[PDB]
């Protein structure tokens, strides 16, 4: 359960890429999984059944290996019944994201300097990871807590924290990288001291 770390140690090769697959079926979830592991040696991070009857595949490797496993996944998933709901292929995922893929993490206390918080929810899991990668890469914000389709039936959310102008730039780039997969977004410019650090309880 240490395969979700940001950087590997000195005895392991560097695997910076990330491929996320969301399928409406679980059977061809496993078919897409072993086809992607047959075509290119991608370290599969998870093959997990999430709520609203979906199957979530996360694989990790180099850029070419993840690209080849994902093109195998594209040619297997969209075969007949188009069960590929949404897919992601990150050439280099951000360091603050790798610990938010496996388990639902919630934050208990932020900081003393945090000005503003933004909560973002998308209808898929792919759009949540894509927005929670494209935002903190283009703003000095901190991804606090994230939830990926377990317990909330297919939807997925995450909150960022930072300066107000920074989280509004993050809001702009999230709303550009989602467009229609974004359900709602909330730009709280100054949260109450009874809610700072602890939003879900």
């Amino acid at each position: 359960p240490e395969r979700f770390d940001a950087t590997p140690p000195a005895g392991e090769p560097d695997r910076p890429a990330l491929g996320v697959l969301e399928l409406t079926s679980i059977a061809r979830g496993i078919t897409v999984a072993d086809a992607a592991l047959k075509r290119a040696p991608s370290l599969l991070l998870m093959s997990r059944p999430v709520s609203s009857g979906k199957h979530l595949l996360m694989m990790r490797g180099q850029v070419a290996e993840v690209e080849e496993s994902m093109i195998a996944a594209r040619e297997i998933a969209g075969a007949g019944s188009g069960a590929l709901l949404d897919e992601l292929e990150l050439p280099y995922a951000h360091e603050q994201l790798w610990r938010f893929l496996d388990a639902p993490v919630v934050a208990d206390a932020w900081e003393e300097d945090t000005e503003s918080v933004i909560i973002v929810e998308t209808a898929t899991v792919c759009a949540a990871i894509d927005s929670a990668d494209a935002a903190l890469k283009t703003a000095p914000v901190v991804l606090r807590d994230m939830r990926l389709a377990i317990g909330i039936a297919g939807k997925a959310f995450f909150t960022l924290t930072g300066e107000l102008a920074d989280v509004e730039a993050a809001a702009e780039v999230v709303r550009e990288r989602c467009g229609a997969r974004l359900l709602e977004l909330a730009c709280i410019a100054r949260p109450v001291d009874e809610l700072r650090g602890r939003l879900f309880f």
């Binding site: 503003s116 107000l164 102008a165 509004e168 410019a189 100054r190």
Partner: protein
């Protein structure tokens, strides 16, 4: 220095509602209020430009419901002569 934000209301109650909504809407600093007579009072907040640009656009929305808003304006850099000549909070 810091960005400037103002809500002028003909009335003390609308100014108090706007001054509450500005400091609840974003992280600004309410420094005081200017009494130019005749019923006009101006609440003055002062902080960085995104916080005052959100705070005035929320305080205008909250102060039109309770009173009469005269003028709303945000200055991102007031000149040093303006801060030295007018009572706007950062007079040295």
């Amino acid at each position: 220095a810091d960005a400037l934000g103002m809500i002028e209301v003909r009335g003390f109650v609308g100014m108090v509602e706007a001054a509450d909504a500005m400091v609840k809407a974003a992280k600004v600093e309410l420094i005081g209020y200017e009494k130019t007579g005749g019923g006009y009072v101006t609440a003055v907040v002062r902080g960085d430009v995104a916080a005052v640009k959100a705070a005035t656009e929320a305080g205008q929305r909250a102060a039109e419901r309770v009173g009469e808003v005269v003028a709303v304006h945000v200055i991102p850099r007031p000149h040093v002569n303006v801060d030295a000549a007018l009572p706007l909070g950062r007079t040295p």
